[PDB]
């Protein structure tokens, strides 16, 4: 899981 | 003939429409932002489920805010007649009110602006939808254990509908392996809906499916066990079904 | 018991909730801020459509920026178990993101945070509707002529629904005689289709209304022959319908 | 164009229909049957009723037996190409499977033969309508209280709706001055619901309606106190919508 | 609480009711009565059908007329007051109002009489739902190519839906290898519709299957190249989902 | 009411 | 195909 | 009409  | 209405979008023209994909996955190191691992996923389930509903797909990959612009600018110079809607997809990194190309920014607002009803004639009347997969900011969702008339004349601003991954304001969630949770959701719910609901009704199955199958997974404690909530933008004025007749 | 789905809001409850009405018709001299012609028309409109929803409804005229956080903080204090849903309108002047008090401004997050999923209980999972009347900037329209689970959480910014009356960045207009144009569609669409039709298919229907019936009229030509479209914003993750069983 | 639906009948051609309405109300004084007052509420109900359905009404009074079969034929050797449907009403004296002409009986079947699938072109494929207001026996209710494929073809007997007014083997009630209980049961229904349901939706709430809200009062104990169910049958392949577009 | 509709049956009673099967496809010699080949398949798929409705199934096989109306009797003397609906599914050879026992024949009348309204209590105000698969006698269909109130009471005949296999007077067919034409397409619309679709827009879709899928295939001249359509007669006074809340 |  |  |  990673943000933009 | 018989009594007739027009509660719903008139979507039997020869042509659906367009659907733009914009995949920005590698940006110039000199902006110091991050590659979107996963965005291919999300790229390549977009282009599938939409060439699916009869969409005319064009993927664009890693454009600069001056390409993004003038690929705007030349879709909405062409004619639309013949097309039912319009439908832009645009997958990067993002703040309030913004979507960054590959070298720098570029305001939503520009981009949808070439879309007016008195800018673009040809789609005057007709769903402009923009989805975007991108952050609104940088908050985190810690989440919670469950007269007059003449002169008939339509806004400019009608007509659009803005699907954001995430509510204003808020940092919008990505998986590396099975793509961002807004697309992966989107994607599936038109697979299994657009053949019988109204698209409103999709986007709401869309918003819970993404607020309760989804949940963060980190290492660092400030961004572990976060959720999320798209945020659904209409200023639509008929409903809209992607089937006919 | 026969196959089970839930995709609509439990709206069965033994009350319908409350529905709080804020009406803002005269400011501070201080502030500069015109005498709101018309609000008072809206406001009893307002008060008959939700009555007839079933809704326990509570009007408030000229409230401060103090007096409108002390209500809103001690409504979202009470009890709502009982209650299906939450509906608030503001009727005042504003600009983007924000709504005044007769002496000064509130933000509509301060508001809305009160009814976070976390910060009131007894409204988590429940539909919570902020209907709002006022300006969100200063532009005008001049239209144009026609895996993983675990530990079930929900976003503490689900089910919100914000039924803006113009698009971000627009003006809002108001009719000094028929009150504004959006709280006037509203009311006649909800006592047209509220027991029919699902409620974001009422707001298109309202978005429709307000898109195609008003156009302004000005002895300044820079306020004359301007359209609005309302704008919905929609976190909601059900189907919404006032009518049960 | 987009994906395509074929689930409802092409209610769009140039004209909905003809609606024949035969009202037989006086008989020959040699058949022994009684004159059924009130038919002329019926008959003028259905006329105003169907109009608004845009209907091209044709309305015949007291018709032999003979002329009842002429009358068929003739209309269904009409040219019903740019037509949507067919209607016929029948307002008559009657037994299971019959109805009287004003001289003797005529088989429901002949009536309805004419417009089988491969006796009238022009209509195959169409929805055909047949409302009989009349008695199907002399049974009174009591109440309670409370692979392979090829070479298309079709049934000639598919796309029939009989909507009778009672069930098999029961007398049919009409009220002197209100008209009949299912007449006026289906006007109301038709002119409530015609631009929002589907029409077996609207017939089975014309089955309610006729079921809780009349009851026969007589001073003939025989006949006091009965009750009424209408029977729909249907033989239709695709919902039915009085509107479109 | 707010708004209450009732257009619908409540189906959320603990239980959706009995699913009586009468699989009758050996018949005594005696009678003349040929066996019915491929019974067995539509008897299994009305068994799995039904079981993922949700009903308590009760297959039985080759009943003499004296069983049947036992069986019948038996049933409409049980406690219904926790259950929703009552289904019978009657397989055998059959005429216009009669079904056949393995050693002669039960008129249809005789069965739903012990559900009436006033026979059997539990089940008042139930939908009572008979699906009959049996010829209806001997015509083969050859196919086209393409005021006042109180005491509140309700008919005894009220609530009754009739999905018979054929149109009145004709044959029915059964495919000796898949089964009935009607029943595979009765099984196969309720899969896929159920948790969507109200039953009688379930059984128009029934209808078009019969209707447009299936010819017979014979050596015989006669018996060629027929077509079918089923006949929905519906005393239902609302609307039927197989789903609830 | 009469019957028809 | 047969006839019941 | 004014506007808010």
Not at chain 2, 128 to 139: D, H, P, S, V, Y
């Amino acid at each position: 899981d990673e943000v933009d | 003939s018989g009594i007739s209405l027009d509660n719903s979008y008139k979507m039997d023209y020869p042509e659906m429409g367009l659907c733009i994909i914009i995949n920005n996955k590698n940006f110039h190191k000199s902006t110091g932002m991050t590659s979107r691992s996963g965005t291919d996923v999300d790229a390549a389930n977009l282009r599938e489920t939409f060439r699916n509903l009869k969409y005319e797909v064009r993927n664009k990959n890693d454009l600069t805010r001056e390409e993004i612009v003038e690929l705007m600018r030349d879709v909405s110079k062409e004619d639309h007649s013949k097309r039912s809607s319009f439908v832009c997809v645009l997958l990067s990194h993002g703040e309030e009110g913004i979507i960054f190309g590959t070298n720098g920014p570029v305001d939503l607002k520009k981009i949808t602006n070439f879309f007016r009803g008195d800018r673009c004639r040809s789609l005057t009347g007709k769903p402009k939808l923009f989805i975007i997969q991108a952050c609104r900011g940088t908050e985190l969702d810690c989440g919670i254990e469950t007269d007059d008339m003449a002169c008939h004349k339509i806004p400019v601003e009608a007509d659009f509908l803005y699907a954001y991954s995430t509510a204003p304001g808020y940092y919008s969630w990505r998986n590396s392996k099975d793509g961002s949770w807004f697309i992966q959701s989107l994607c599936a719910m038109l697979k299994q809906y657009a053949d019988k609901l109204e698209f409103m009704h999709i986007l709401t199955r869309v918003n819970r499916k993404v607020a309760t199958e989804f949940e963060s997974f980190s290492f660092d404690a400030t961004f572990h066990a976060k959720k999320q909530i798209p945020c659904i933008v209409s200023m639509l004025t008929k409903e809209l079904y992607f089937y006919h007749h």
